[PDB]
């Protein structure tokens, strides 16, 4: 019914590492075009949109559209059982995960009935910043020392204030490049707690793309190889 073989199994491991602490429970939309996961976090402040195209799987068979409700902490534990060089095959009330290193591991994960949800409109963004993922990870991790909110001003500027004082991190337009595509400057405030969840996706992509416009969710986009993307939407304060 469904069988997908991912030779670069570490993509799936990193994907679950980038979701399990933000999303408890998600529905894995499975079809002939690939794997799609869309879910808000419990507080509906952020939205995750994961796309893994069928063409990026080394083998892909899907004869009906499946909606697999998955406990992402449960799924993460099983993917902990895969080595970073293992070929992972997904297969389908249960999801079968087969890890091939000689050594073949075979896991069966109970699914759950999840009926979940939202449509994301295509949008033009005033500003699009593209920067090294590790830089964005530090910026958000460092500024959370100072305040619980960040003002993103687009060079691009990240600002936070708290009881310690305040900080401003300034990136100038230059792989390790910083590119800014701007028709209009913007200045938006976001909760750093969510951004530090988004940055758990950093191992997936050497680069992250920020897309912003006045009064619209921020988009934090991690490109996944040739096979898709992990997008994070964060509602501005």
């Amino acid at each position: 019914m469904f069988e997908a073989r991912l030779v670069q199994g570490s993509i799936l491991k990193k994907v679950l590492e980038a979701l399990k602490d933000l999303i408890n429970e998600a529905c894995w939309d499975i079809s002939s075009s690939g794997v799609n996961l869309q879910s808000m976090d419990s507080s509906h402040v952020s939205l995750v949109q994961l796309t893994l195209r069928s063409e990026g799987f080394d083998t892909y068979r899907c004869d009906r559209n499946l909606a697999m409700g998955v406990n992402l902490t449960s799924m993460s534990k099983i993917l902990k059982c895969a080595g970073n060089e293992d070929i992972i095959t997904l297969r389908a009330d249960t999801l079968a995960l087969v890890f091939e290193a000689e050594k073949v591991s075979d896991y069966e994960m109970k699914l759950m009935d999840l009926d979940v949800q939202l449509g994301i409109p295509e949008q033009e963004y005033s500003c699009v910043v593209k920067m090294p993922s590790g830089e964005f990870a530090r910026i958000c991790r460092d500024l959370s020392h100072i305040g619980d909110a960040v003002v993103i001003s687009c060079g691009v500027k990240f600002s936070a204030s708290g009881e310690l004082g305040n900080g401003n991190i300034k990136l100038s337009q230059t792989e390790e490049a910083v590119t800014i595509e701007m028709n209009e400057p913007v200045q938006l405030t976001f909760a750093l707690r969510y951004l530090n969840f988004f940055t758990k996706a950093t191992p997936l992509s050497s680069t992250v793309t920020l897309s912003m416009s006045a009064d619209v969710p921020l988009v934090v986009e991690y490109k996944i190889a040739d096979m898709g993307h992990l997008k994070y939407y964060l509602a501005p304060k």
Partner: peptide
């Protein structure tokens, strides 16, 4: 803090 459903 606004939520995602107001924009989508």
């Amino acid at each position: 803090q606004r939520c995602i459903p107001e924009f989508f």
